[PDB]
Amino acid sequence: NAMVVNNLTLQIVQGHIEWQTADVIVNSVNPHDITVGPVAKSILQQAGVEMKSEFLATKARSQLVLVTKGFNLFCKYIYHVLWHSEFPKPQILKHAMKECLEKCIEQNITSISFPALGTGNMEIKKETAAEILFDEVLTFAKDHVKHQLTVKFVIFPTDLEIYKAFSSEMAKRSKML
């Protein structure tokens, strides 16, 4: 459950997203309230109260990914994916991914770790999230091969099913290429 495409390393990992080390860790929030949701909470606790200040002070809107520093996370930046409510969810994911990965070229990011975005509450189906997540990652690997990137998909330990889907999607993908 890891593979290298050109200058891109991609790994599936069972752990907590807020306990990661990477240039960038991806948050997943409702923009009206970043104190709600599994990932948003984990991150808010770990990163500390000062993370919610820079976040409320920099929303001021079509911004799909808000960027902050990492505070007490072992990261340089946090990319907060903002799920706005007036959009198709599979499209928000697909667009939030590309932006997050484009920002990786913008900020000379070498490593980025993402949770299983959009699987919360069964909003996007597990295989579809995985389909989309790999889709965009692989796209980037082909379209910007000059940029070295380590991408982790962090799956929560108890979420065995989500894990089984990402393995399978990765398997499927490597069978090509």
Ligand SMILES: NC(=O)c1ccc[n+]([C@@H]2O[C@H](COP(=O)([O-])OP(=O)(O)OC[C@H]3O[C@@H](n4cnc5c(N)ncnc54)[C@H](O)[C@@H]3O)[C@@H](O)[C@H]2O)c1
């Ligand atoms: N308004 C909506 O219709 C809508 C749609 C999508 C997302 N959202 C917002 O985003 C969140 C839900 O979407 P999501 O799926 O990106 O987020 P989430 O916070 O529910 O987590 C999504 C997935 O990541 C897993 N996960 C990975 N690492 C984890 C960790 N360290 N702790 C806990 N869970 C972890 C979760 O169990 C789940 O499978 C909520 O905050 C919600 O407001 C809202």
